[PDB]
Amino acid sequence: STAETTLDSFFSRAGLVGEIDLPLEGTTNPNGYANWDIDITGYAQMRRKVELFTYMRFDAEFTFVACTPTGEVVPQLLQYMFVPPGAPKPDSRESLAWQTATNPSVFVKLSDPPAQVSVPFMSPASAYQWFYDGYPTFGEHKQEKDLEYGACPNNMMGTFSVRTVGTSKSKYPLVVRIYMRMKHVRAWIPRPMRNQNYLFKANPNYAGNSIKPTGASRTAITT
Amino acid sequence: SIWYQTNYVVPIGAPNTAYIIALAAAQKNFTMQLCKDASDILQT
Amino acid sequence: STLLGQLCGYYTQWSGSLEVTFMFTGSFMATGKMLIAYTPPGGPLPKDR
Amino acid sequence: VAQLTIGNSTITTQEAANIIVGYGEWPSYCSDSDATAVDKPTRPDVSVNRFYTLDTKLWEKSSKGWYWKFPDVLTETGVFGQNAQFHYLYRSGFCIHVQCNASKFHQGALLVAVLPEYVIGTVAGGTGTEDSHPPYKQTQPGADGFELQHPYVLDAGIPISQLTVCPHQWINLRTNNCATIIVPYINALPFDSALNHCNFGLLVVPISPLDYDQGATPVIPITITLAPMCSEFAGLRQ
Amino acid sequence: VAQLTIGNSTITTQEAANIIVGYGEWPSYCSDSDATAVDKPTRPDVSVNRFYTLDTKLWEKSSKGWYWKFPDVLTETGVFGQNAQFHYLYRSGFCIHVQCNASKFHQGALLVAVLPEYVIGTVAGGTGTEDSHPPYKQTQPGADGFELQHPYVLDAGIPISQLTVCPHQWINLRTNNCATIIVPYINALPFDSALNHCNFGLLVVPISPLDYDQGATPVIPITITLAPMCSEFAGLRQ
């Protein structure tokens, strides 16, 4: 059977994509909240996988597993807010973004099972694309510089704003691990698979000291 | 106008210069009108 | 040099289409590409290929 | 051998040639697409869709390879360039014909391939922490094309050994002297910017080096001929 | 390639050859002529009309060109020479086959043409007032043929650049190696003198010089093979 090599099976599984620390004291997230832009490549092996193709469509199932750094389950109420592409993110814990109805919020207890939601295909284009040979629109005129190269902006998927419910800081140190699973995957235009280490998140730049894929051989004649 | 698109390519043993001969003629829609005798020099 | 031009010397006005066929007489092993361009009257000689 | 003529341009090619159509799909006008009535975008057929022949490249024993970006390769040449520059939206297919002129005493192999969304990655020295983004002349080289710095990784961190997954054709001096690739419009949008987005890049890279005995012609010409298939432009002018 | 045999003579030529018939008219017997009954002139077809192959010429980097006069070229050779020399009146057509043997590393072009009533003009030094007329060996060179002094004016004050107005064929070493010309009897009379009148001259002139890299065979052979078409002789003997 060949159902294991379908694209759906190839991306099928749910992987850790982000961790959110909400400590009692510290410099990390002092205001008891965090904004997490949806990053497909949070799961390490995912980027190279996904970059096997040029264009892709998919749904995303997000699951939120919360606990304390010891894995302890505590009586705390959380809010998972999905800030859509184009909506302004909360800048404080008292921001009015937290109560904007058009930002879907999920209210779960840490006692409850992990929260779970589906995100549709958010792009205004017909497909996400991991490669964009060109500078972003509008065109031209000059433009401002070359800095913008290789950045497709239609890949924007949204943002998850994670906070503890309430006006007072939580009594518990929390960690919110979020898992993403790709649904209904389609992909176009196969590409050669990355064989050099990645350097930056938004471009294919590589170290000027490049390596072979492998080469454990002395001469072509000896195995 | 005749332009070099590519360089002239030869293997070893072939001469490095060659000649083009240009031949010209008129097509069947060609016509001439007002006759006019005018040439060189007769029998010196 | 053409018989055409010499027959034009015996007339005053003429009009029509012309054919110029080029023949390459290099060795059989020689190869390459030429660009032969026609510029209509009034137009200047093209500055580059 | 025959005479191939479209528009005012005429090339000398061989009927005995094997054509590869990229992804099994011929270029087509976007009647499928979006906004129609009113009104459909200007489409040029007789005049603009001609044989544009780029200045030939000389490929040597030491050559690493070249690439051209589309439609960037033509947005500075003919009436295609005029249309691409003075319109708002653009889409088109392409007929790419790459041809070599060499003798039977020369040898070498070229990989002629087309890679949609060919993004370039230059370096700062190996390694970071911070990045230099490549300049216009390296990302949009115009009709002259640009030469590869690191062919093995295609100047973008990906092995050239797998480039044959893209629409390609080999030019083996022993077997053939020409390669013809037909590329349809490939994009996540029906229309895009002609000047700011290069839908694909053409690659011509030596996998097997040029060789010859001393006395034979040291540089072998690579002639690229290309012709827009189903051009389409929307917008006005300046 | 095939075997072409007429009479006792056999040559090796190619079927893949393009023949040019002079003035679009095939050689023919002069049933047209009314001097008949009695009686019609001796006409030899089986024996005399064979392949006469002249001694080959060696054409060099410096060669200017050759010409042969007809029927003079044969009035000293075979049984044709015998009929032409021992008869009163003569007329005939001709099949002229000119062929080169060269390698693919040689180059050059020959113009093979037929010029009716080819009158020669020599000089006295440039110029007059009085004239030297050319000798027998320059006007009737026999089977050896004569070499041009001033090819540009065809040794007769006429431009060779316009020689293509006569029945001709190019021998481009790159393309072909042979030329075949068929000549009918051309004259203001139905019969004439075989020894005192040369109805036409054959011209073989290098327009594009022979070339080769040194080490290649310095001289390329030009082989003339000719066969009378519709011979006709009147008179008796000595």
DSSP string, A168-218: S--SS-EEEEEEEEEEEEEEEEE-----S----SSS----SS---S----S
Bridge partners, E57 (sequence order): E222
Output the CA torsion sign for C11, C13, C16, C19: positive
Q: Which letter does DSSP use for residue C31 in this model?
A: B
* Beta strands E232-234 and E89-91, pairing class: antiparallel
Q: CB–CB of D125/A199 below 8 Å?
A: no
Burial classification of residue E8, based on how many CB atoms lie within 10 Å of its CB (0-12 exposed, 13-18 middle, 19 or more buried): exposed
A100-105 — which CB contacts under 8 Å span 24+ positions?
Answer: A103/A161, A105/A79, A105/A80, A105/A81
Cited resolution, angstroms = 3.2
Give the one of D53, D56, D103 whose C-beta lies nearest to C31's C-beta: D103
Q: Chain A partners of D186 at a C-beta cutoff of 8 Å?
A: 188-189
Question: E strand or H helix at D66, and its extent?
Answer: strand D66-70
CA–CA gap between residue E234 and residue E238 (Å, rounded): 13
- The dihedral region occupied by B22, where left means phi > 0, alpha psi between -120 and 50, and beta the remainder, is beta
**Residue pointed to by tokens 């020369």:** D106
CA–CA gap between residue E228 and residue E80 (Å, rounded): 9
CA–CA gap between residue A172 and residue A78 (Å, rounded): 12
Assign E41 to helix, strand or coil. coil
CA–CA gap between residue D198 and residue A149 (Å, rounded): 12
- Rounded to 5°, angle at Cα A123 from A121 and A127: 80
Question: Residue ranges of the alpha helices (H) in D95-198?
Answer: 136-139
Q: Which domain holds residue A109?
A: 1-223
Verify whether the Cβ–Cβ distance D116 to A210 is below 8 Å: no
φ, ψ dihedrals at A132, nearest 5°: -135, 90
Q: CB–CB of B23/E165 below 8 Å?
A: no
φ, ψ dihedrals at A190, nearest 5°: -65, 150
Q: Which residues does E233 contact at the CB level (< 8 Å), separation at least 6?
A: E41, E42, E43, E44, E83, E84, E87, E89, E90, E194
How was this model experimentally determined? X-ray
- Rounded to 5°, angle at Cα A54 from A52 and A59: 90
Verify whether the Cβ–Cβ distance C3 to E208 is below 8 Å: no
Q: Two tokens at D99?
A: 């041809």
Q: CB–CB of A163/A78 below 8 Å?
A: yes
With CA atoms as reference, the chain C residue closest to B32 would be C14
Domains and CATH numbers, chain D: 1-238 (2.60.120.20)
The alpha-carbon radius of gyration of chain E (Å, integer) is: 19
CA–CA gap between residue E51 and residue E226 (Å, rounded): 6
CA–CA gap between residue A95 and residue A89 (Å, rounded): 9
CA–CA gap between residue D11 and residue C40 (Å, rounded): 20
CA–CA gap between residue D7 and residue C23 (Å, rounded): 24
Q: Which letter does DSSP use for residue E18 in this model?
A: -
Question: E strand or H helix at E12, and its extent?
Answer: strand E9-13
- CA of A28, closest CA in chain D: separation in Å? 23
CA–CA gap between residue A143 and residue E58 (Å, rounded): 71
- Report cis status (omega within 30 of 0) of the bond before E129: yes
Q: Which residues does A26 contact at the CB level (< 8 Å), separation at least 6?
A: none
Cα–Cα distance list, A113 to A66, A96, B5 (Å): 9, 28, 73
Which one of E208, E210, E217, E220 would you mutate to disrupt binding with B, by most B Cβ within 10 Å of its Cβ? E208
Q: CB–CB of E187/E153 below 8 Å?
A: no
Q: Is D221 on the interface with A (CB under 8 A)?
A: no
- Rounded to 5°, angle at Cα E114 from E112 and E117: 150
How many Cα atoms are found within 13 Å in the side-chain-facing hemisphere of B8? 13
Nearest Cα to E207, choosing from B21, C21, B25? B21
Q: Chain D partners of C31 at a C-beta cutoff of 8 Å?
A: 101-103
CA–CA gap between residue A19 and residue D59 (Å, rounded): 53
How many Cα atoms are found within 13 Å in the side-chain-facing hemisphere of E132? 11
Question: Looking at the 3D structure of chain A, how many domains does it have?
Answer: 1
- Report cis status (omega within 30 of 0) of the bond before E127: yes
Verify whether the Cβ–Cβ distance D216 to B8 is below 8 Å: no
| Length of chain C, in residues | 49
The alpha-carbon radius of gyration of chain C (Å, integer) is: 16
- The dihedral region occupied by A114, where left means phi > 0, alpha psi between -120 and 50, and beta the remainder, is beta
Q: Chain A partners of D122 at a C-beta cutoff of 8 Å?
A: 205
Bridge partners, D197 (sequence order): A134
Q: Rounded to 10 degrees, what is the CA torsion of E203, E204, E207, E211?
A: -170
Q: Chain E partners of B10 at a C-beta cutoff of 8 Å?
A: none
Hey, what amino acid is at D45? D
**Residue pointed to by tokens 């390609």:** D168
Nearest Cα to E116, choosing from E164, E185, E204, E27? E185
Q: Two tokens at E17?
A: 């050859």
Chains A and D are in contact, defined as 3 or more C-beta pairs closer than 8 angstroms? yes
Q: Two tokens at A144?
A: 């401002």
Domain of A92, CATH number, reads: 2.60.120.20
Bridge partners, A22 (sequence order): A174
Buried b (16+ CB within 10 A) or exposed e, E81-104: bebbeebebbbbbbbbbbbbebee
CB atoms within 10 A of CB E13: 16
Q: Which of residues 163-182 of E touch C (CB under 8 A)?
A: 165, 170, 172-174
Verify whether the Cβ–Cβ distance E173 to C27 is below 8 Å: yes
Give the one of E104, E159, E208 whose C-beta lies nearest to C25's C-beta: E208
CB atoms within 10 A of CB C35: 14
How many Cα atoms are found within 13 Å in the side-chain-facing hemisphere of D68? 27
CA–CA gap between residue E133 and residue A198 (Å, rounded): 93
Bridge partners, E192 (sequence order): E90
Bridge partners, C35 (sequence order): B3
CA–CA gap between residue A192 and residue D166 (Å, rounded): 9
CA–CA gap between residue D116 and residue D163 (Å, rounded): 12
| Length of chain D, in residues | 238
Question: Residue ranges of the alpha helices (H) in chain E?
Answer: 79-85, 136-139
Verify whether the Cβ–Cβ distance B9 to D220 is below 8 Å: yes
What's the N-to-C CA distance of chain B in angstroms? Answer: 41
Assign E131 to helix, strand or coil. coil
